[PDB]
């Protein structure tokens, strides 16, 4: 069955062999069930855990981590001729924390399932149909409704599935489709066919989706789609079908790791170029073949030095701690990845209904006839503060509280919209708010009646149950309904007769068929005959209410005071109903629409603020788009919007040079399919522009896919918040704009500590290249490499993602997403640092062989030979060769590299900043990781088994002394590094010089001079 709402009824149930009197019998039920299927959509397959694991291999930084583990497992494995089995145990530690942080990886998306299901109402859809086994209607289960079957649907009824109307019971069908299309008004319902095939959701009149609910009538129909089949079900299909690329801080991590993996193979390549033909000596190898074995050796080290194993456990940390911020703030964050995305986000699509506005219609503007005479009047204007439908708030009039208990006109405009409408407010604890029962205007003029307490009821000790009706029924008791004449469409206006516990009749409609039947007026409590300047200054008011800077939906109020008695009624035609109030006296009228939220005008200037610019992508027409753009601030008040709103027709019509400039102008689109959104979102991210796209509803779930970052309303549908990757549960649109603010502060502290990570695996790298070309031992064998990397090298890191926030950070424009993580100059300020670390450690264990008080004395680089003395050969000297083993040499170079890693992140607080300017106690948490990881340090070299696992042994004062002397000098680089960067502290210097003058008392010449 295709294209529904082109055939009329006749034919579509013909086509299914359905009649509307009796139904279908049980046979044909089954075989339509056999045949199409569950009326469901499918739930999201479990991803289970292997599955996680084995996709968590795709970045590139896990693998290169695994590739080196690997690696260095297969060596292990090479590695035969050893004994002592605690080898092996190198490779092994690297695995625990490729697990780790993965669980992490795991376990945050869990949890933020853990708060995505729990804010579902999982109510089972319960509707009723009618079929020939009974002639009553039954009530089954949502998944039992097959196409072809016949359903009855009522006011309050959630839809079902795709239904082809056949015939409305009550006078008209009101269906309020902001779900599916974002409408937010209610649509009239016909079973009149359309003709067009390709109308839109909107044009089919004679369709009720599914997920939509009734808001006025009754009516039958007949069900043509069902399951997957439904618009929603096609709008979830072309969800899935878009694929969601990697985050912006993903992209650039893989690039990282990418160069790092090119820096990584260069070195290998260079480090054997330069070891290789070095065999001709008369040693062992066979041929370079036992040598292969040594130079393998060297080359997994390299490797193990230049890849920072604690890069992404702190990482890791700073996305659970900035998802943890989210949490506080009111914000599920669905992958930790995506917290940062908001910080580089530069463009904003929001969703209008239900997303910028609150998509509860409510009175913000009402008038009262005040005084009156010949040809003029002044009229008494009051402003509404509700946005919502919940009862509180107060009435203004000229900017100052008042009460409407001394209005008359208040009281009667306040019964008559108690009165007249039909619908109601109710509160429930599951959701704990407020929810309408009929049409949005008449559950909003309910909420008016209730705000503005004519009759000064007591509200102070009143429970919230009965506080959505609390005034309402005062009214309704002492002025009980007798009948109602329902809306017709060509009086446009309908009317409520009731009496007394005199006798007056209300009605309520448009402003201009009101205002033409009536014949009186209302001023205070007295009547008065009909003068024009009254009509022309009232109908001003309306269009300038109407079409004016804000537009609202004006309603026209009117008692008629003298109406027929209820004996002379007709009720059974429609054109007697105008007749019946050809003269009426009319009290005011009122002005509602679908407010926005109080929170989002000081959130559109923020984000202009920063850079970011906000576009409404929106279902509804233009010129409530346009509306709720000017009052949000999107567009001035007299702002001209004639190159900046543009429709789904108009942009589709447009050139695609046009759409260039309209894309990077437009701010307002209105009357946009889900696929005209997900094209929209597509074209903005074809300008290299990270897209944030923010909504609720079915219509937004591909496009909140399609963008780089999507943010769901809490009260938005499940696809919605299964489509994307933030939820607001307390629709707060200001979070958006914390998000933001964190994420470009958790951004610059991941550029700082990768920077430090970065510097601290160069120095290691130049080190072991250093020993290797030198000819010297190993000073850093790679276990030591894996606790100082891990330990030293996350602590700091830790702590330095705990780094102040820039004062000028929500001030400046989006950073350019093409920019690296290390420029040129950084990159050069890096490699210096890094070079000076190798150097240094290299130094020290050189100054340990030949100049050292407590060792050997093998200087001028003789005798350095490595692997190379085995007896007393002339070119032996006097110490032995076992202390080429000795673990004092490989503890210097570890202290050295630890106290320069400290300092490293001592003076890594700022960016260009002196350490001068910014004293290091700024960020309590920097120095208490130094100090921790110092301890951790000390505890390492004077504990009983770690000194067995690691090579070292404990030091001693004059050790310790020449480690602080060699390590300090790198503030000094780092410091002279910022300051020809920036170019082209009074209590700081005081705790200086409990350090720096000690390091003067002693001074070596360290007796090396024979070549470096
Ligand atoms: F729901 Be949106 F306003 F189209
Ligand atoms: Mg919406």
Redesign the pocket.
């Known amino acids: 069955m295709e294209n529904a709402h082109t055939k009329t009824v006749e034919e579509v149930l013909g086509h299914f062999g359905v009649n509307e009197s009796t139904g279908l019998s049980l046979e044909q039920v089954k075989k339509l069930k056999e045949r199409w299927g569950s009326n469901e959509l499918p739930a999201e397959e479990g991803k289970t855990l292997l599955e996680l694991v084995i996709e968590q291999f795709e970045d590139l930084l896990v693998r290169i981590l695994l590739l080196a583990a690997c690696i260095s497992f297969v060596l292990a494995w090479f590695e035969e001729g050893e004994e002592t089995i605690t080898a092996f145990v190198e490779p092994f530690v690297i695995l625990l924390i490729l697990v780790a942080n993965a669980i992490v990886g795991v376990w945050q998306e869990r949890n933020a399932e853990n708060a995505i299901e729990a804010l579902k109402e999982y109510e089972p859809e319960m509707g009723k149909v009618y079929r020939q086994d009974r002639k009553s209607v039954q009530r089954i289960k949502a998944k039992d409704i097959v196409p072809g079957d016949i359903v009855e649907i009522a006011v309050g009824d959630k839809v079902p599935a795709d239904i082809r109307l056949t015939s409305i019971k009550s006078t008209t069908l009101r269906v309020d489709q902001?779900i599916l299309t974002?409408e937010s008004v209610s649509v009239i319902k016909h079973t009149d066919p359309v003709p067009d095939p390709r109308a839109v959701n909107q044009d089919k009149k004679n369709m009720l989706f599914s997920g939509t609910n009734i808001a006025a009538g009754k009516a039958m129909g007949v069900v043509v789609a069902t399951g997957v089949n439904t618009e929603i079900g096609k709008i979830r299909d072309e969800m899935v079908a878009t694929e969601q690329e990697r985050t912006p801080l993903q992209q650039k991590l893989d690039e990282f790791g990418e160069q790092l993996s090119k820096v990584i193979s260069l070195i290998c390549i260079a480090v054997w170029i330069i070891n290789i033909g070095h065999f001709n000596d008369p040693v062992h190898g066979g041929s370079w073949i036992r040598g292969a074995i040594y130079y393998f050796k060297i080359a997994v080290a390299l490797a193990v030095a230049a890849i920072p194993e604690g890069l992404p456990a702190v990482i890791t940390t700073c996305l659970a701690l900035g998802t943890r911020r989210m949490a506080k703030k009111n914000a599920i964050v669905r992958s930790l990845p995506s917290v940062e995305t908001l910080g580089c986000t530069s463009v904003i699509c929001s969703?209008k209904?239900?997303?910028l506005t609150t998509?509860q219609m409510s009175v913000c503007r009402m008038f009262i006839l005040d005084r009156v005479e010949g040809d003029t009047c002044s009229l008494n204007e009051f402003t509404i503060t509700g946005s919502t439908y919940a009862p509180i708030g107060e009435v203004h009039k000229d900017d100052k509280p008042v009460n409407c208990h001394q209005y008359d006109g208040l009281v009667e405009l306040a019964t008559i919209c108690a009165l007249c409408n039909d619908s109601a407010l109710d509160y429930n604890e599951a959701k704990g708010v407020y929810e309408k029962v009929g049409e949005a205007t008449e559950t909003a003029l309910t909420c008016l009646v209730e705000k503005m307490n004519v009759f000064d009821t007591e509200l102070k000790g009143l429970s919230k149950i009965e506080r959505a009706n609390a005034c309402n029924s005062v009214i309704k008791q002492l002025m009980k309904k007798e009948f109602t004449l329902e809306f017709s469409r060509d009086r446009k206006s309908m009317s409520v007769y009731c009496t007394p516990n005199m006798s007056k009749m209300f009605v309520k409609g448009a402003p201009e068929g009101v205002i033409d039947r009536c014949t009186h007026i209302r001023v205070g409590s007295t009547k008065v005959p009909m003068t024009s300047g009254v009509k022309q200054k009232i109908m001003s008011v309306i269009r300038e209410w109407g079409s004016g800077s804000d537009t609202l939906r004006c309603l026209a109020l009117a008692t008629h005071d003298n109406p027929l008695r209820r004996e002379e009624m007709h009720l059974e035609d429609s054109a007697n109903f105008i007749k019946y109030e050809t003269n009426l006296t009319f009290v005011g009228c009122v002005g509602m629409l679908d407010p926005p939220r109080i929170e989002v005008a000081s959130s559109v200037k923020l984000c202009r603020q920063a850079g970011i610019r906000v576009i409404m992508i929106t279902g509804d027409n233009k010129g409530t788009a346009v509306a709720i753009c000017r009052r949000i601030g999107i567009f001035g008040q007299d702002e001209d919007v004639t190159s900046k709103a543009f429709t789904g027709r108009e942009f589709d019509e447009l050139n695609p040079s046009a759409q260039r400039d309209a894309c990077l102008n437009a701010r307002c689109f209105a009357r946009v399919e889900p696929s005209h959104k997900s094209k929209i979102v597509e074209f903005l991210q074809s300008f290299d522009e990270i897209t944030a796209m923010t909504?609720?509803?079915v219509?937004?779930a591909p496009a909140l896919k399609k963008a780089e970052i999507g943010i769901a309303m809490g009260s938005?549908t499940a696809v919605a918040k299964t489509a994307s990757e933030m939820v607001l549960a307390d629709d707060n649109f200001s979070t958006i704009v914390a998000a933001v603010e964190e994420g470009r502060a958790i951004y610059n502290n991941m550029k700082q500590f990768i920077r430090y990570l970065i510097s601290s695996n160069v120095g290691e790298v130049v080190c072991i290249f250093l020993t290797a070309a030198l000819g010297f031992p190993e000073a850093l064998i790679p276990v030591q490499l894996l606790w100082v990397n891990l330990v030293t090298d996350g602590l700091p890191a830790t702590a330095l993602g705990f780094n102040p926030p820039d004062l000028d950070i929500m001030n400046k424009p989006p950073r350019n997403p093409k920019e690296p993580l290390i420029s040129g100059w950084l990159f050069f300020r890096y490699l210096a640092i890094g070079c000076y670390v190798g150097a240094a450690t290299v130094g020290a264990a050189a100054w340990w062989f030949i100049a050292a008080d407590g060792g050997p004395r093998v200087s001028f680089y003789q005798l350095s030979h490595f692997l190379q003395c085995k007896e007393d050969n002339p070119d032996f000297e006097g110490v032995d060769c076992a202390i080429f083993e000795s673990p004092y040499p490989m503890t210097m170079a570890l202290s050295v590299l630890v106290t320069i890693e400290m300092c490293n992140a001592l003076n890594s607080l700022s960016e260009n900043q002196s350490l001068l300017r910014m004293p290091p106690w700024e960020n309590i948490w920097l120095v208490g990781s130094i100090c921790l990881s110092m301890s951790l340090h000390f505890l390492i070299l004077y504990v009983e088994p770690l000194p067995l696992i690691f090579q070292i042994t404990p030091l001693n004062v004059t050790q310790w002394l020449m480690v602080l002397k060699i390590s300090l000098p790198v503030i000094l680089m780092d410091e002279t590094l910022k300051f020809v960067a920036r170019n082209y502290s009074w209590p700081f210097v005081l705790l200086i010089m409990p350090l720096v003058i000690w390091v003067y008392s002693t001074d070596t010449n360290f007796s090396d001079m024979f070549w470096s």
Do not use: K, L, Q
């Open positions: 902001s974002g969703d209904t239900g997303t998509n909504g609720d509803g219509n937004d938005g």
